[PDB]
Structures are given as structure tokens and as C-alpha cells.
Design a protein around this ligand. Structure first.
Ligand SMILES: CCCCCCCCCCC(CCCCCCCCCC)(CO[C@@H]1O[C@H](CO)[C@@H](O[C@H]2O[C@H](CO)[C@@H](O)[C@H](O)[C@H]2O)[C@H](O)[C@H]1O)CO[C@@H]1O[C@H](CO)[C@@H](O[C@H]2O[C@H](CO)[C@@H](O)[C@H](O)[C@H]2O)[C@H](O)[C@H]1O
Ligand SMILES: CCCc1ccccc1OC[C@@H](O)CNCCCc1cn(CCCCc2ccc(OC[C@@H](O)CNC(C)C)cc2)nn1
Ligand SMILES: CCCc1ccccc1OC[C@@H](O)CNCCCc1cn(CCCCc2ccc(OC[C@@H](O)CNC(C)C)cc2)nn1
Lengths: 439, 119, 441, 119
């Protein structure tokens, strides 16, 4: 079995390194770049510190404990080793939901995705999260509240060679609830409305994709620790069928989660550019999703000189004629900024909404639609013009008649649905459902 | 999704004074950092003054003592008081907003406004 | 001598009687009257339900124990009686601490006194507080986690006739902290910043700003009533039994009679006081304090017809001229009476005057910008009351104010002809001039 | 806080119209809303009330002929009177209830008049 010993040594040692390596990579990136100084990043920084202290002060000694099949560091470190262990786990689950609540108050604020907290206010919150979860994790252990009274524990408590965590089931459940389930339940509830409010006002916008990353951070965390925490309240409510080979194995599922977050953060483009440098390497929203933004002059799907969020600068092939009116609209001679591309969009959209109301074939249709399917109509008038949207009266009156499923089968036969099918299907599917499920 | 609008530029004789002012909308202006940049002809776009949401202010060395950046959160506006004007201060002045989102901070610029000085 | 035992029985019966009476009265008002359906009052309610449970379920049995000199109800009720006792004290401070935080999110929002909570959200928070408070009170006692291990505890736990609350040193501290001190100092901290953001955004003269003071008194007494008990609890547990039990039982009864005190602190509010009386068979805001508000034509100190928030109608003495000007100002035939919406529509217009009329008045504009925001209003007040006619007509203090000689400017205006006609409003604004603060408003 | 009505016109009997009201100074989300009418020689009367949660109450004399509604995004409340009768002629006022610490407060707009015209 000496093959098993050395082979597990390399895996555990690899695990310990991946934790320390990736988490320090996060702490460094948020500390370097000013672009990354956000309140959410400050919570992620402390979240990384929890995983970092895991990889330094916890996972190693637990790796040494297993392959040596015995505890080596005396009794004092034993009480401390498991207090730091609980301190890290409780601080993460609390911090993960101080994010979910901070994300909630933000999506109900003028700038969705903008935290309402001061950078120094966010610091204090993190300071108390560690100050509180430290009290509720060290005091019960340093004061012996966890301890059991069966001789098998009283002996292990006496020998400085045994460091198994025998606990009276009062501790085992009480601490399991206050420090895991209670924050976990709040988190899953609070952040769920966050996701809902995000589409009411899927997962295509940049900061929307960021919230699904915050979700995946929470998600993998619960999935890695819930088996450990589930089969330990049953293990006390029903007498033990949980053999110790399994309890420490499900706990190591919780240990490796500390290496997961740096990987997950590579879903944000903002974090990858930081990592790569560190290693020497709503109607308006709906249309930005499927029109894209480009700050120069480019050829579109039909070959015309467009710019920004799908603004046709001209139909002529001469780029001289494209610039000719590109600078006629900005104000200067642009020969445009992201802010210039923005106010040309807000002025092109209103032109398409008045262009809907000055059409007697579209206005009665646009009048009877909800907020969402109106936006679906304006997306067609934007991409085409009111003259072409007056085309399929068949579909135009099917929408008015509130025969959504019928109107959705006719629209998918238009030439529109096969020259830009991926975008067409998104406008037709929101016609069908009245929701934003596709955007 | 936020918007910026400068106001209060133009000409004035040297030694004159101007008060450029920028109004913002789209975010909690209280939690945003604010600053003024200028692009003189034949030069690159340089910072003149910045005010952080905490109040701290740095200035361009050329404008130190002459310009004062200041903030009014009640009206969502930030003010550059250009005093003791010099012909070198001739540039299109820009209003900048730094709005923090989830994992990153976003930059937001005004259209700009001209200031011509006469020796 | 049995004279003492029947004397306290009468005194204790009334204490229980007062508690139950005044708190059924409070709960009734907030439920009957539609004006009182504030989220702040839904907290007032459960605060009174916690006081009602004490009056019924707790306090009387603690009275029987003292007079009977022993516990006669067995050990089941003995452990139930106390788990209820601590449920009412923890569910309270946890609500008095939610009020202080709710009033903080109210004074940082446009309407300075509007809760950001729904009624429904307000009352799931109440349900939560009671659930949570119960599980951090009933569970550690019904599960015997409080139990001490010295012999006296063990012998008292075994007597059906002994119901002392012997506790282990860990429970005594971990309970007092989590159940009392933590919500106490969050409350004392968060609410003190509610009080100053009020005095900042302009003491205790506005109606609602007295309501905030009324809440502060509720907390203020609650702390003082229950704090001596909770301090001597900690000093005994940590050191040794230097605390007697008759002093511990008296300091405990101070927090007991607190349950009957809130309903009369509520008589401070005109809202509860008129509600109880029916149940029982019976610069903008600166000038609004100093002017008042009247919906019918009245005569000011100098005899001029005025309406609304100190809005002058005419220098003429013919009431028909006052009504005619008032109808032209409001745009309908008032016959001398207006509405509050119209009165402060005029007031908003009339304040705009008092600032523009000083933008244009001789040397009295430089003194305006020579002073700070809190003294600018203290002079716009004098203008509003007297125009740029008279406040420009005493340059002795105007120069004194420009030269920042305020201790002098304040003695001159104390002799001014204006001082002797409106003395109290004269000195509130004189102090606003001298101390440069909102101390008088 | 302040209220701002709009939408009063002369209508033949059986016709229809809608009323609007903008508001400022509170969180329109949280305030109950409703319209009141008063015809000369008649006392002020509740016509329709939309509570903050969205419940609706209508006067019996006008039940099934009036629809109160709100849009908390635009800070407004709407009333679609249809099937107007000669009896409905009155001056309509906009009411907003804004809760304070211990009590709830009333606020009204300046007013609008509706008058149904017989043949
Ligand atoms: C509002 C807030 C209140 C908060 C709670 C206040 C904290 C105090 C509670 C701490 C607490 C449970 C903790 C439960 C988990 C909760 C923590 C989770 C924290 C969150 C993350 C453990 O308390 C600890 O018990 C240990 C015993 O092993 C002991 O450990 C060490 O002791 C040795 C040297 O100290 C040493 O040999 C060795 O090292 C350990 O043995 C500790 O010294 C002792 O403090 C109390 O446990 C209770 O203790 C009671 C003893 O009488 C006991 O009652 C029994 O006796 C009764 C007649 O006497 C009888 O009538 C009952 O029938 C009977 O059962 C209860 O059954 C038991 O449950
Ligand atoms: C129950 C709540 C735990 C917890 C609460 C909050 C936040 C975070 C929490 O956890 C964090 C984990 O990272 C803890 N790591 C495990 C200890 C460190 C440790 C592991 N090893 C391996 C030896 C295991 C053999 C053993 C088997 C049974 C034992 O007794 C069972 C019972 O006494 C404990 N009950 C639990 C099942 C709930 C004791 C030891 N020896 N010492
Ligand atoms: C530890 C914090 C308690 C607490 C927590 C949360 C919220 C609210 C809390 O409080 C509730 C008050 O309503 C106090 N009620 C208890 C007395 C009610 C009572 C009286 N009686 C009989 C006579 C009591 C005389 C006596 C004196 C000392 C005793 O010894 C106990 C010893 O442990 C002292 N330590 C304590 C200070 C923690 C026992 C009895 N038996 N029970």
C-alpha cells in the first residue's frame, strides 16, 4: 500500500498547491488593477482568503493526518486546526450571501449591477463577518462545548495522538444549522430573486453573465458541502451507519471546493485579462444584445457601411459616402466613441417607435401589445423599417388577435427568419411567451 | 446606460475665468468617482482634476492652484472652476464618470466642450 | 406580620393590571384606526404583545413565588415559565432594534419618515423575529443546555417546589450577549445616527421628529430598566456570588414593570393620544416650525392678515381685501379658508421670494454669502418674517454678522424691536445665529 | 410631496375618458392611491381606490364602469372611466396616502373637472 501512500501524497500536494496558487492569483489581481476595485470584488477577495487559509492551515495537516493514519502535532494544534477549519467554512457561506444580498439591493437600483455600499463600508462588513464567524466557530471549540462524553471520545481527548472530532449531537446539529443551513437558505432565496429581477428588467448581457458566474460560485459551493452536512445531521438523528472512510471522503469534497473559485472566475472576461497579464501572457438592452456594438465602420450582413449598434450609415458602396454622414450625425469629423455610439442608438430607437406610430398598419398592433412584445415589434422595425414590418399583415394581425402560437409559425417562414435566424428566433420566441426567456 | 452633459465653455481673455459643469444621470452619483480631462491640440488626452466619491482630489501639475474641482451630489453635477486662465489651457474638456459594476468599473465620457484662451 | 404580604399582593395585582390594560389599549388603536397602519406601528404591536404575554404568563407567577415564598406550580411550568420570560425579553430588544434600523432606512430616503418595507414584508419580519427568538430561548432551556452542575442546582432541579434559575457560567454569558447586548448596542449605535441625520437634514420641533424622539424614549427606558439586571448578572457570573438574591430579584422586577411603561410614553404622540381618548369613552421645515400652519385667515403679531405658513395677504386692514387677494393667489373663491396642499403651495412660492428679495437688496447680499447654510436660513427667516425692509434696517448687527462677531450680533438682536414682539421665535433664530447650529429646532 | 392631475374633457353621455396623476416626494410604490369626485351641491365622494399592493375598490354608483390602475415605473395612477352618465359630472381629485412614523398622511392634487353632456 506504499504505492497508495506516495500516490495520494502527490495528489493531495497538488490539491494544496492548486488552492494556494489560484487563490493568491485572485487576491493579487484584485489588489493590482483599479478596474477591479468593486465591492463585489472585495467580498471575493475575502472569500479567497478563506480558501487560502484552507490550503495553508487546514488541508495540509488533514492530508498528513490521513496518510500517517495518526495525528502528529500534539493536542493544542488539534483544537486549533479544527477551529480554523470551521472558521473558514462558516465565513465563506456567510460571505457568499452577503454577496447575494448586496447583489439584490443593486438590481433594484438605478444602475443595475452597481452596489449601494462604500468601499470602506464593504471593508467593515467583511471585518465583522470574520469577527462573528470567528466567535461562533472558535468559542464553541476552545470552550469544549462540542465535546462528547462516551469513553471512546474521552480517551481520544486525552491522547495527543488521536485528533478525531467527536461531538455531542447538540453541537453537531446546532452549529450545522446556524453556520451552514441558515445562511445557505437565506442565500438561495435572496439570490433567486436577484436572477428573477435581472430578466424582469436570459444571460446574454455582460453583467448578466457575471451574475450567473456569482451563481456558479454559490452553486458549486453548496454542492460540495451539502453531502457532508446532510449525512451528518442524519448520522446523529439516526444512529451511525456512516463509516469514517466515507465521512472524511465527503469532507474532502468540501476541501477541494477551495480550488474551484479561481477556475470559475475565468468566466468573466475582466478576470481573464487580469490573470493573463499576471502570468506573462428593456427594449434598449434587447437590441444591444443582438445588434452588437462596434466603434468603427463595418460591413453588415447585407454589405452596408454600418456602425455602432446597427446604424445604417448609408447604402452606397463608397466609404466616402459612409463617413459623409457618419460625421454629419456625431457633430465632429469622426473619420466614434462608445458614448457616441450610445446616443446614436437612443436616437435611432425613438425614430423606430415614432415610425411605428405614424404607420396606420402597425400602430393598432403596437397599441394592443404588452411591454415585452412591443419591444419585440420595435426590434423588427429597427432591423428593417416600418415599411417592411407592414409586410406580413398576416402575422401583424395574428399578434393583434393575441394568437401568439399562430403568429410564431408564420414569422419563421419569412426570409427574415433565415437570413438572420439566430436573432429572428429570439424575437419570435418572446412574441410567443411574453417574457424575456431568450434574451 | 448613464449619460453625461458638459456645459459652460467658450472663449475668454487670458487671466479670465470659466466654470465648466457636468451633469450625470444613470447611477448613484454619490458612489462614483469623477474627473475632468482635456485634449489640447497636437497633444494627448490628459487629466486635469479628479474627485473621488470620498472627496479626495488630485490635480494636473500645470493646473494646480488655478483650477478647483468640486462636487454637488444634490444635483448630480461636478464642477471645474478654471481660474487664472492661460493660453495653454485651450482644449476640448471632457467629463469622466467611473461607475462600478459587478466585477469591473466602467468608464463614461461626456461629449466635450471647447475653451479657447487669448494671450 | 401578614400586613406586608397582602400589601404587596395589592401592589403587584395593579402592576399586572396596568400592564394588561395599557397594552390591550395600544393593540386596539393600531388595529381599529386606519390612520395608524404604519409599519412602525406593526412593530409597536408585537412589542405590546410581548408585554401582554409578560403581564399574563410571566409576571403573576413571579408574584406568587415571592408571596408564597416558594414555587407551587411544579417543574414543568417552572421551565416553561422562564422559557417564556426570556422569549418576551429577547423578542422585544430584537424588535426595538428592527425599529431603529427601519427608521434608518426611512430617514435616508426622500420622505424622511417612510418605511421602505411593505406591510406584508413588515409582518413576515415579525413572524421571523418571534420564531428566531423562540428557538434561541425555548430550545436551550427545554433541552437543558442552561443547566448548572453544582450541587445546589442539582438539588433545586430535583425539588418540584424549587424553581430558581441556576445556570452554567457559559449559558449566562452566551445568552446575555446574543439575546441582549448584541441587539442593544446595534440599537444604541444605529438609532443615534437616525437622530443626528434628522437634526442634520433640517431640536425636536417637527411633528415626525418628535415621533423619532418618542421611539428613542421607548428604547431609552427599556435599556435603563433592563440594564442594571444584566450588568449584575455578568459581574456575578464572572467573579463570584457577591450579588445577593434579593437584589437580583429586585433588579429583575425593574425590567418587569417596564412592560407597563410603553403605553404612556405613547401619549407623547398626538396620534395615539387622540386614539386612546376615543377608545376610552372620552429653511422649508425651519420656517414651518417658526411660522406655524393655519388654514384660515388670521392676524399676525402686528395685526396683518396672514394665512397658511406665515403668508402675508395684505397690509390693508379690510378683511375683504385679504379675501380678495387670497382668491387671486389660490385661483378660486376661498372665503378665507384654504387647504393644506394650497397653503404650502403658497409657502413654497413665498420662500422663493424671501431668497430672491435678498439677492437684490443693497449691502444685504454680501452678508448672505458671508455666512454658512445654517445662518443663511436664520436670516432668510428674518426676511420671510419682515422682508428686506426691516432686516436691512438694522445694519449694526449686519456688519457684526459679516465680521463674524456673533456673540455681539446676538445681543443687538435681543434688544431689537423685533425681539420684544416675538420673543421665543426671536431667540431660536438668534441662537441659530450665535451657535451656528440647529440646536434650537 | 406633490401631485399633478391631467385629463379632463367635455364628453357626450356614454362616452369615455381617462385620468392621470403624477407624484413626487415619496416612494409611489408604497403609497395607496385613489380618485375622489365632488359635484356642485354634492359632497366629496370616493370613486375608486388602488391600494399599494394592488387591490381595487370602486363606488357602487359607478361599479363596472370605472377602472383605477397605476404604473409605479412612471410614478402615476390612472382611471379609465367608460360609459359616462350625466350623474358622473363632478370635479375629480387625485389622492396619495404617504405613511409616516406613527400615522398616515393625505395629499391631494389641484384638481380636474369632468362634465358629461346630454343631447
Ligand atoms: C441564548 C444563547 C444560548 C447559547 C448556548 C449557551 C452555551 C452553553 C451550552 C453548552 C452545552 C451544550 C452546547 C450545545 C451546542 C450549542 C453550541 C453551538 C454554538 C453555535 C456554533 C455544553 O456545555 C459543555 O458540556 C461539556 C460536557 O461534555 C463540557 O465539556 C467538557 O467537560 C469537561 C471539562 O469541562 C471535560 O471532561 C471534557 O473536556 C468535556 O466533557 C463543557 O465544560 C460544558 O461547558 C451545555 O450542554 C448541556 O449541559 C448540561 C450539563 O449539566 C446537560 O444537562 C445534564 O445535566 C443536568 C443536570 O446537571 C440534567 O438535568 C440533564 O438531564 C443532563 O442532560 C445537558 O444535557 C447538555 O446538553
Ligand atoms: C459538524 C459541523 C462541522 C462544521 C460546522 C460549521 C462549519 C464547518 C464545519 O465543518 C468544517 C469541516 O471542514 C470540518 N472538518 C472535519 C473536522 C476535522 C477532522 C477530520 N478528521 C478525520 C477523522 C474523522 C473520523 C471521525 C468520525 C466520527 C467522529 O465523530 C462523529 C461526530 O462526533 C461528529 N458529528 C459530525 C458527523 C456532525 C469523529 C471523527 N479528524 N478531524
Ligand atoms: C441569563 C440571562 C437571562 C435572560 C436571557 C435573555 C432574555 C432575558 C433574560 O432574563 C430574563 C429575566 O426575566 C430573568 N428571569 C430569571 C429570573 C426569574 C426567576 C426567579 N426565580 C426565583 C427567585 C430568583 C432568585 C434567584 C437568584 C439567583 C439564582 O441563581 C442563578 C444564578 O445562576 C445567577 N446567574 C444568573 C444571573 C444568570 C437563582 C434564583 N426563578 N426564576
Amino acid at each position: 500500500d506504499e504505492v497508495w501512500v506516495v500516490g495520494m501524497g502527490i495528489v493531495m500536494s497538488l490539491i494544496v498547491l492548486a488552492i494556494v496558487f489560484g487563490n493568491v492569483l485572485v487576491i493579487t489581481a484584485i489588489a493590482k488593477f483599479e478596474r477591479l476595485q468593486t465591492v463585489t470584488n472585495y467580498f471575493i477577495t475575502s472569500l479567497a482568503c478563506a480558501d487560502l487559509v484552507m490550503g495553508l492551515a487546514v488541508v495540509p495537516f488533514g492530508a498528513a493526518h490521513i496518510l500517517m493514519k495518526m495525528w502528529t502535532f500534539g493536542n493544542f494544534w488539534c483544537e486549533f486546526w479544527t477551529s480554523i477549519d470551521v472558521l473558514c467554512v462558516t465565513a465563506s457561506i456567510e460571505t457568499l450571501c452577503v454577496i447575494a444580498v448586496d447583489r439584490y439591493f443593486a438590481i433594484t437600483s438605478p444602475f443595475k449591477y452597481q452596489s449601494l455600499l462604500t468601499k470602506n463600508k464593504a471593508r467593515v462588513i467583511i471585518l465583522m463577518v470574520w469577527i462573528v464567524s470567528g466567535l461562533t466557530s472558535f468559542l464553541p471549540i476552545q470552550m469544549h462545548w462540542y465535546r462528547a462524553t462516551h469513553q471512546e471520545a474521552i480517551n481520544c481527548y486525552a491522547e495527543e495522538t488521536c485528533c478525531d472530532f467527536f461531538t455531542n449531537q447538540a453541537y453537531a446539529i446546532a452549529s450545522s444549522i446556524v453556520s451552514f443551513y441558515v445562511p445557505l437558505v437565506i442565500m438561495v432565496f435572496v439570490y433567486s430573486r436577484v436572477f428573477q429581477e435581472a430578466k424582469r428588467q436570459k444571460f446574454c448581457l455582460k453583467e448578466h453573465k457575471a451574475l450567473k458566474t456569482l451563481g456558479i460560485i454559490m452553486g458549486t459551493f453548496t454542492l460540495c458541502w451539502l453531502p457532508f452536512f446532510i449525512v451528518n445531521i442524519v448520522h446523529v438523528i439516526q444512529d451511525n451507519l456512516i463509516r469514517k472512510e466515507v465521512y472524511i471522503l465527503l469532507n474532502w469534497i468540501g476541501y477541494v471546493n477551495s480550488g474551484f473559485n479561481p477556475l470559475i472566475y475565468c468566466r468573466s472576461p475582466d478576470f481573464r485579462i487580469a490573470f493573463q497579464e499576471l502570468l506573462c501572457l428593456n427594449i434598449f438592452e434587447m437590441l444591444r444584445i443582438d445588434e452588437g456594438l462596434r466603434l468603427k465602420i463595418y460591413k453588415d450582413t447585407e454589405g452596408y457601411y454600418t456602425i455602432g449598434i446597427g446604424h445604417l450609415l448609408t447604402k452606397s458602396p463608397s466609404l466616402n459616402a459612409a463617413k459623409s454622414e457618419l460625421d454629419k450625425a456625431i457633430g465632429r469629423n469622426t473619420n466614434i466613441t462608445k458614448d457616441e455610439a450610445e446616443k446614436l442608438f437612443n436616437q435611432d430607437v425613438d425614430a423606430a417607435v415614432r415610425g411605428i406610430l405614424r404607420n396606420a398598419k402597425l400602430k393598432p398592433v403596437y397599441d394592443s401589445l404588452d411591454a415585452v412584445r412591443r419591444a419585440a415589434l420595435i426590434n423588427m422595425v429597427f432591423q428593417m423599417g416600418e415599411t417592411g414590418v407592414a409586410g406580413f399583415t398576416n402575422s401583424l394581425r395574428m399578434l393583434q388577435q393575441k394568437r401568439w402560437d399562430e403568429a410564431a409559425v408564420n414569422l419563421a417562414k419569412s426570409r427574415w427568419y433565415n437570413q438572420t435566424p439566430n436573432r429572428a428566433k429570439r424575437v419570435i420566441t418572446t412574441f410567443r411567451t411574453g417574457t424575456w426567456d431568450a434574451y | 446606460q448613464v449619460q453625461l452633459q458638459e456645459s459652460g465653455g467658450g472663449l475668454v481673455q487670458a487671466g479670465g475665468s470659466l466654470r465648466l459643469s457636468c451633469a450625470a444621470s444613470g447611477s448613484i452619483f454619490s458612489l462614483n468617482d469623477m474627473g475632468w480631462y482635456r485634449q489640447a491640440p497636437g497633444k494627448l488626452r490628459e487629466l486635469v482634476a479628479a474627485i473621488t466619491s470620498g472627496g479626495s482630489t488630485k490635480y494636473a501639475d500645470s493646473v494646480k492652484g488655478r483650477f478647483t474641482i468640486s462636487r454637488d451630489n444634490a444635483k448630480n453635477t461636478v464642477y471645474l472652476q478654471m481660474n487664472s486662465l492661460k493660453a495653454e489651457d485651450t482644449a476640448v474638456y471632457y467629463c469622466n464618470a467611473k461607475v462600478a459594476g459587478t466585477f469591473s468599473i466602467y468608464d463614461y465620457w461626456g461629449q466635450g466642450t471647447q475653451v479657447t484662451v487669448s494671450s
